[PDB]
Design a protein around this ligand. Structure first.
Ligand code: 4C9
Ligand code: CL
Ligand code: CL
Ligand code: CL
Ligand code: NA
Ligand code: NA
Ligand code: NA
Ligand code: NA
Ligand code: NA
Ligand code: NA
Ligand code: NA
Ligand code: NA
Length: 268
């Protein structure tokens, strides 16, 4: 494979299985002997590989402390590999649900800052995540949360995941204009981040659990909004709620959100 991001699959070793969900199978292993890596094997026939491989360099050149660090890719062979740093604490959703952790709200707010910093960066690069959620944020050994799987939704082939009315579509993290009119923008990521904050302060509860995905869709349009989690103060709830303005252009930017979050942090 030729390219500044191309990794030699011969430099990879596969040591342990990690899971088989978001866009493909994931393996833990070593890169060049030294570095721990996670290797995501995109399920063969998963998406527009001509399209992904084409507009991959944009994704790969993204660099921020709160984005899971991409080391490279293997695109000559099939399946396509994506190699990242190993995140020892796994997906944020499982991390939140683990009852032995006993979080303080101080830690929850820090998680929200970590992700907001990452999303602020992506916003400044006009790069949409399109599927922000706790299930695809990652946590490292030091408890730092990082954003992952950013932008991959673009190349999904299955209309069950691509179409708003689809079976596997992330309805619960989507705003009205996406569910009705499939309008993805910076403001749809804003909406999703709000639901993520709700996931965090709810310690991993499913949004709108009492409703199915089709019922949730029906209720969002019509003005249903997530209630205030018990662990969320009024100021925290105000922040996440501001992400859910019906009119997209009335929602804040990630710069503003980060500023709000830092003010609350300074108030303890
Ligand atoms: C999550 C469970 C639990 N418990 C869980 O933590 N994981 C599900 C199985 C995969 C695990 N995993 N995936 C990666 C990973 C992700 C994405 C890429 O490639 C990218 C990165 C950025 C942008 C686009 C594409 C590579 C690798 C992991 C890493 N790096 N470390 C550790 N585990 C990783 C996560 C529920 C099923 C409970 C939600
Ligand atoms: Cl803890
Ligand atoms: Cl999408
Ligand atoms: Cl308050
Ligand atoms: Na391990
Ligand atoms: Na950084
Ligand atoms: Na603790
Ligand atoms: Na934290
Ligand atoms: Na999506
Ligand atoms: Na939008
Ligand atoms: Na409420
Ligand atoms: Na309060």
């Amino acid at each position: 494979g030729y390219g500044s991001w191309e990794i030699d699959p011969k430099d990879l070793t596969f040591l342990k299985e990690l899971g088989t969900g978001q866009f493909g199978v994931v393996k833990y292993g070593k890169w060049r002997g030294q570095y721990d890596v996670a290797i995501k094997m995109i399920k063969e026939g998963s998406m527009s590989e001509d399209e992904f491989i084409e507009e991959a360099k944009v994704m790969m050149n993204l660099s921020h402390e709160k984005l899971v660090q991409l080391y490279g890719v293997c695109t000559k062979q099939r399946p396509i590999f994506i190699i990242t740093e190993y995140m020892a604490n796994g997906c944020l959703l499982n991390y939140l649900r683990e009852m032995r952790h006993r979080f303080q709200t101080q830690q929850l707010l820090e998680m929200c800052k970590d992700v907001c910093e990452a999303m602020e960066y992506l916003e400044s690069k006009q790069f949409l995540h399109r599927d922000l959620a706790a299930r695809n944020c990652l946590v490292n050994d030091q408890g730092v949360v990082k954003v992952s799987d950013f932008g991959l939704s673009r190349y999904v082939l299955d209309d069950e995941y691509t179409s708003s009315v689809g079976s596997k579509f992330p309805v619960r993290w989507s705003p009205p204009e996406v569910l009705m009119y499939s309008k993805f923008s910076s403001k749809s990521d804003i909406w999703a981040f709000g639901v993520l904050m709700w996931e965090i302060y709810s310690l991993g509860k499913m949004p709108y659990e009492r409703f199915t995905n089709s019922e949730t869709a029906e209720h969002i349009a019509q003005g249903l909004r997530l209630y205030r989690p018990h662990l969320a103060s009024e100021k925290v709830y105000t922040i996440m709620y501001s992400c859910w303005h019906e009119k997209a252009d009335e929602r804040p930017t990630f710069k503003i959100l980060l500023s709000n979050i830092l003010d609350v942090m300074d108030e303890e």
